[PDB]
């Protein structure tokens, strides 16, 4: 009955706990005791992009390391050239409350979503010079939190109704739906080889998903409050999470437990965004404090600080060739660091 | 500069020419967030104010004396709201509607008001409070079937304040109960405030037509206080 099932669940949880305790034969910080610190990392602004009218809420770099897309809650999606600070495109939206955006790897499409439970897909290269709406994808019962392209005909969405979905653009219907969380989902990140993806939920829960089968394979716990950001390490064998309790942590998918935790005693505000560097030696985090912190991944110490914002930092990104860092905050400005 | 550079700069200049029009249109429109429970009459106030003119949000536009208000109502969401509420940290006002004829559910309304009043991202946003469905309260108190002191003991020692205005000619008991309910909210509002935001209470029923003016007057008061803060 129900009681027998609950007892079985507790027993298997205990067995999993023993299996995970039996594997930690070494400490990450003790092997890395002999590694040289990177030193002090001072970074300066090279450009400041002005033009939004309200909070900037999402951002994304392009495959060409030269073009950006940015989204604001005044109802705008702007496409920038970061070399000359020129504006290439500016698109108005049907719904003002936007919470995510993305580029496509081929540079032909963009996507957006928000409180209205819809993902809108836009075409950049048309017969004329106009950017027009190609698709409206519907089927969720909650707001969209994140979306990322796989190719020109497949997209992934995560929502605040506790489920994730894979969509085929040409027809307009779901091919597979992933369930298992209890609270809302907050973020996603795609593998370098594009066959799996990770998810973090408004709980102390993160999961790994196989796209083709459509089922979960691993779950990870360890936080105290909501998870806010997540991303992949370059080799696809790690990920780093931030949470609304002033703690970041690193997980690996082969030892199946955490390895390092980045925290401090005077930090009492949560993390909003996370992003890795090219070689894996820098980990960049945003705090509503209102700062950005640059941590050394293998030592758990702050290598640098970035300041110059007057309000909460909400989005952060790095390039594919590793030549810049872009930061966007609730004061309506974007800044590029190098 | 070659042909390409001139083309790029010209296109950028046109884009800025458009954003200038957008900024003027944006700053002259006011935005309000509407909140209430399922037994509130909130839908009826929406339908009433519409005379002044699936989906996860609903929008209404109305206009008073050439000023434009956009009111936003939340639908098709779950029962947890500690995340999307943060999107509403730069609105002019929150309109909170509450049913005052149901004694069994007033405590939940009070706790809701406490949670909204003390959040981190909403310490600058003011609240306009509507106490709805007064005729039902009048009928229930006059009939005398259920006793208010069963749920709130302190009502056994409350005296009508001197600044009351029972204008229409009602029974004194209606005035006592009405002002007790109002003071229950004013106490929370006064206790934890810091002079940075206020609460404006009103008594409303299902046939009133004066709600738009009330919102209008309260908004003028809010904006004057901002402009006076600008001059120190």
């Amino acid at each position: 009955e129900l009681d027998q099932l609950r007892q079985e669940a507790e027993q298997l949880k205990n067995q999993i706990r023993d299996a995970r305790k039996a594997c930690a034969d070494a400490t990450l910080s003790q092997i890395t005791n002999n590694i040289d610190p990177v030193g002090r990392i001072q970074m300066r602004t090279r450009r400041t992009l002005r033009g939004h009218l309200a909070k900037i809420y999402a951002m994304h770099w392009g495959t060409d390391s030269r073009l950006l897309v940015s989204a604001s809650q005044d109802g705008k999606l702007i496409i920038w050239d970061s070399y000359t600070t020129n504006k290439v495109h500016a698109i108005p939206l049907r719904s003002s409350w936007v919470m995510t955006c993305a580029y496509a790897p081929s540079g032909n499409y963009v996507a957006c979503g928000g409180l209205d439970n819809i993902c809108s897909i836009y075409n950049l290269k048309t017969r004329e010079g106009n950017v027009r709406v190609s698709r409206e994808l519907a089927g969720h019962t909650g707001y969209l939190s994140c979306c990322r392209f796989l190719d020109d005909n497949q997209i992934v969405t995560s929502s605040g109704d506790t489920t994730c979905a894979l969509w085929d653009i040409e027809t307009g219907q779901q091919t597979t739906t992933f369930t298992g969380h209890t609270g809302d989902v907050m973020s996603l990140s795609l593998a370098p080889d594009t066959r799996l993806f990770v998810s973090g939920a408004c709980d102390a829960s993160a999961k790994l998903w196989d796209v083709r089968e459509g089922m979960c394979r691993q779950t990870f716990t360890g936080h105290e409050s909501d998870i806010n950001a997540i991303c992949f390490f370059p080799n696809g064998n790690a990920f780093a999470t931030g949470s609304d309790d002033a703690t970041c942590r690193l997980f690996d998918l082969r030892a199946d437990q955490e390895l390092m935790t980045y925290s401090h005693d005077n930090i009492i505000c949560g993390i909003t965004s996370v992003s890795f560097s090219k070689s894996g030696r820098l980990l960049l985090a945003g705090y509503d404090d209102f700062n950005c912190n640059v941590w050394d991944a293998l030592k758990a110490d702050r290598a640098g600080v970035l300041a110059g914002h007057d309000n909460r930092v909400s989005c952060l990104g790095v390039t594919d060739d590793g030549m810049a860092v872009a930061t966007g905050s609730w004061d309506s400005f974007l800044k590029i660091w190098n | 500069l070659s042909a390409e550079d001139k083309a790029a700069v010209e296109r950028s200049k046109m884009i800025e020419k458009q954003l200038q029009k957008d900024k003027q249109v944006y700053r002259a429109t006011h935005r309000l967030l509407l909140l209430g429970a399922d037994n509130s009459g909130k839908s009826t106030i929406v339908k009433q104010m519409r005379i002044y003119h699936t989906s996860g949000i609903f929008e209404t536009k109305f206009q008073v004396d050439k000023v434009n208000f956009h009111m936003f109502d939340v639908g098709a969401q779950r029962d947890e709201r500690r995340k999307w509420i943060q999107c509403f940290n730069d609105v002019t006002a929150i309109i909170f509607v509450v049913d005052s004829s149901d004694y069994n559910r007033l405590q939940e309304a009070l706790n809701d008001f406490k949670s909204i009043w003390n959040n981190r991202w909403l310490r600058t946003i003011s609240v306009i409070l509507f106490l709805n469905k007064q005729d039902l309260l009048a009928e229930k108190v006059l009939a005398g079937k259920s006793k208010i002191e069963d749920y709130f003991p302190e009502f056994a020692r409350y005296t009508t304040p001197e600044d009351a205005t029972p204008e229409p000619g009602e029974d004194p008991r209606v005035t006592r109960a009405k002002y007790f309910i109002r003071d229950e909210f004013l106490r929370i509002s006064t206790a934890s405030g810091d002079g940075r935001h206020y609460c404006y209470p009103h008594f409303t029923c299902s046939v009133d037509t004066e709600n738009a003016r009330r919102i209008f007057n309260d908004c003028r008061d809010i904006i004057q206080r901002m402009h006076l803060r600008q001059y120190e």
Partner: nanobody
Amino acid sequence: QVQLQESGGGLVQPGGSLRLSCAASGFTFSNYKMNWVRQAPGKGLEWVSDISQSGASISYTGSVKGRFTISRDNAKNTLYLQMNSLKPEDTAVYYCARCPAPFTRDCFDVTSTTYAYRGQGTQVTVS
């Protein structure tokens, strides 16, 4: 992994008394605001009592204002409630509830149909 476990239920006569204990694991106990909620046979989730980080601020609902007493032990990781005179209108299932964020005075989403950080509950019957 956040865990909350309740204890102290049972059956009593009208006018009786008993004590409820909530035990915790998986977080720093000191930084969080704490609550008592209950569910009666045929209704939704209600709110009974509230206590703050240090214990210098308390709050009760009207219907139990003169009878039930709340306390917290931050060193033993426990929340305590004491019941002195019971009516038949108290037969219910009792849960102890946490808050989503540390260092905060607001408290959203405790009485919801699904909430992450909440225990299994205990049964109290008076007859």
